[PDB]
Design a binder for these strands. Sequence first.
RNA 1: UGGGCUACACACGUGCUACAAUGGACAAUACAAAGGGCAGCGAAACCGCGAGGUCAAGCAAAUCCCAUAAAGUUGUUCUCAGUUCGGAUUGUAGUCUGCAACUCGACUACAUGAAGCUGGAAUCGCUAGUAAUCGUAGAUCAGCAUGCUACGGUGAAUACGUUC
Lengths: 176, 60, 80, 113, 77
Amino acid sequence: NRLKEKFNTEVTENLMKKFNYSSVMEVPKIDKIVVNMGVGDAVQNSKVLDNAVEELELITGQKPLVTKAKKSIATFRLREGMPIGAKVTLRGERMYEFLDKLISVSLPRVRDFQGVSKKAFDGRGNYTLGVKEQLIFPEIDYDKVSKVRGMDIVIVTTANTDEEARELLANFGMPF
Amino acid sequence: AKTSMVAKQQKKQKYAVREYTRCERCGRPHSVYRKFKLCRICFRELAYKGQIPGVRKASW
Amino acid sequence: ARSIKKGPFVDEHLMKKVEAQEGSEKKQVIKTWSRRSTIFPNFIGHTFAVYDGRKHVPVYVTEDMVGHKLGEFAPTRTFK
Amino acid sequence: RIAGVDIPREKRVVISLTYIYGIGTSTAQKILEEANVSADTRVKDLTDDELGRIREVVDGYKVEGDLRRETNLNIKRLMEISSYRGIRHRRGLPVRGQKTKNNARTRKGPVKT
Amino acid sequence: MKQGIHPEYHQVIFLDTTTNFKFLSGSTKTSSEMMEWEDGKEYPVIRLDISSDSHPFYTGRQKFAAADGRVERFNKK
RNA sequence: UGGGCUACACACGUGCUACAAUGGACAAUACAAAGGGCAGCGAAACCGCGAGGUCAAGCAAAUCCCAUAAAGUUGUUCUCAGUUCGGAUUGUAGUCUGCAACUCGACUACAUGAAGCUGGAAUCGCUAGUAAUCGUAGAUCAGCAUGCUACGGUGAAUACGUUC
Ligand SMILES: [Zn+2]
C-alpha cells in the first residue's frame, strides 16, 4: 500500500494546502477504477471475448463481469443480451496496487511513450485513460496473446473539478 | 543511343564504380568489347570492311 | 561497409543532422533518403522520414533496431 | 542418452552424436576429440567415464532446447521490430532475397493451383 | 471476495534492473526467485527492463543501455 | 537521390542439384587440352580451420602467374536406412568488391536439415571420339554465371527396315 500511504501522508496535505479546504473531508480521493474492454467482434467469435476476459482477469486479479448488449443493432449484427464486453471494478488496496503498477511498470512500456492525455477528463473530476495494447501490462506474455486489443481505465474520483482531479493524479505520478 | 546518354557517359562520374563502357562508334551500351571499344554489330561491320587490323572470319 | 575492419557505414550528412539538436529534448523528424545508412545507438529514440521511393515513411528507432539499415523499415513494394 | 536425447545405439559415436539438435559433424568431431574417445567405437560399446566426459563437454555448447529458444527469440525480435525480414517471416516468403515468381516452395508450402 | 473464482493473487517486488530499484505491490506474476524486503517477510521478484525511475520520459534523462544488449554488441564490434 | 526491371494465390520452356552402394565420407597418389594477364596475372613465406589479410619475387609472355584439373587408382569406414543420401530453408558470426550488399552480390565457419526413395498423359537430343559423365578457360565484368562461347579426360548402345 505504498501509493495509499503516499496519498494519506503527502498528497492529502499538498492538495489541502493548494485548494484551501476548511475540512479534511473535502480532500478528493480515488473512489474506484473500472477497467473495461469492449469486444464487438465477440459477435463473430465468442472465443475472442473469452481470451479478452482471461487477459483482463490476469491483469486485474479478479474475475471480470461480462457486459452484454443493452439493445439490438442491425448494422453491427448485434442482438440484445449478447456478451460484448468485460469490466472490472477495483476499490481499496487492489485499486491502489493496480494504479501504482499502471503508473510505474506498465505505462512506460508503451512504444514511443510521451505521456497520457491531460484533457481526457469527463469534466467532473473523473479521468479516462485509453490504453491501446494489453502487452503494455507486465502480467501478459506476448506469446499467449492471440490478438492485441486495448482497454479503458476509468479512474473515478471524489473530486468536484477537473483541476482537482489533475492535481490528485499528478501528485500520484501520472505523466502528462 | 541517346546523345544525352553518350554525353553523360563521356563526362566524369562522381563515383568511380559508376563508369560504364559504350561502343564508341554507335553508342550501344551492351556487348562492347574492350580491345576495340566496339559493340558486336560495329565489330562485324568493320571486320567485313577489313578496317580492323588482323581480324578475319574464323573457322576450325 | 559490411567488413568489420571498416566501420559501420552511415552518411556523414545524416549523422551530423542527427547529432545536431542532440541536447534539446524536443527532437524532431529527420527527412532522409539514406536507406543504406546503418542505425547507430545514437539514433535510438529518433524519428526518420525515410524515402521508400515515392513518400517518406516515418520510422521510430528503438534499441532492437540498432545494427540494421534504415531501409529495412521502409518497404518499397506493395502487395495486397 | 546425452543432453536428454537418445542417440542410435548401433551407430558409431561420431555419427550418432549428430542426432543431437545443435550438434553436426564438425562439432561432433570436436567434442569427440576434446573428450578422448575412439572415433569408430559404437555408443553401445562405450564406457561410462567416456559418456560422462561427453556429457560434460556437451552441456556447455548451448544446444537443443536452448538453441531453439534463442533462434525463436531472434526470429520473433525481427518480426516484432517490423523489419523487412520480419515481414517476410510473417508472410512465409523467402527472407534472403530470393525470387518468388518461381521456386519458393520450401517457404510457400505446397502448390495451390 | 468470493472464494474459488478469482485468480491467485500475492505480493511481488518489481525490480527495475536498469537502476536496481525495487517496488513492492500485489500481482499474479509469481516469479520463482525470492528476495528479502525491509519487512521481515520475503516475496518473489519480477525483473523489469524499464520503469518509472528509468524511462526517459519519466526521468528526464537519457536511458542507459543494459549489458548483453544490441547497443553493447554494436559498440563491441 | 530513391525505388521498379529481383513483386507472387498461379501456368509453360530451358537448365543446375539430387533421390544413392556403378555410392557417401576420410587419407595418399597420377594423367590433359585450350585461353587470359599492366596498374593486370599475384609465386613463395607468415596469420586465420575457413573464405581471405600483411609483406612480396617474377612477368607486357613457349620464360612468371592465373593453375594442385576432376572423373580415376590405392587403403579405412558406413551396409540398403529419408540414412554418414540429398542441401533447399532460416539463425548467428565472418571474408571480398564497391563511397554504398535493406529492397537486391558472391563466398566462408557453426547449427538448422524441406521435398525427393528414378517420376502419368506426353515429350526431347544424339549415328562416334558421337551420346553420357568429369572437370578447365574466356567475353562481358569493381563485384556478381546453374547462361553463352571454347578445351580436353574417360567413353558407350543401336540403325533390321520404310508400315506408320
Ligand atoms: Zn557500335
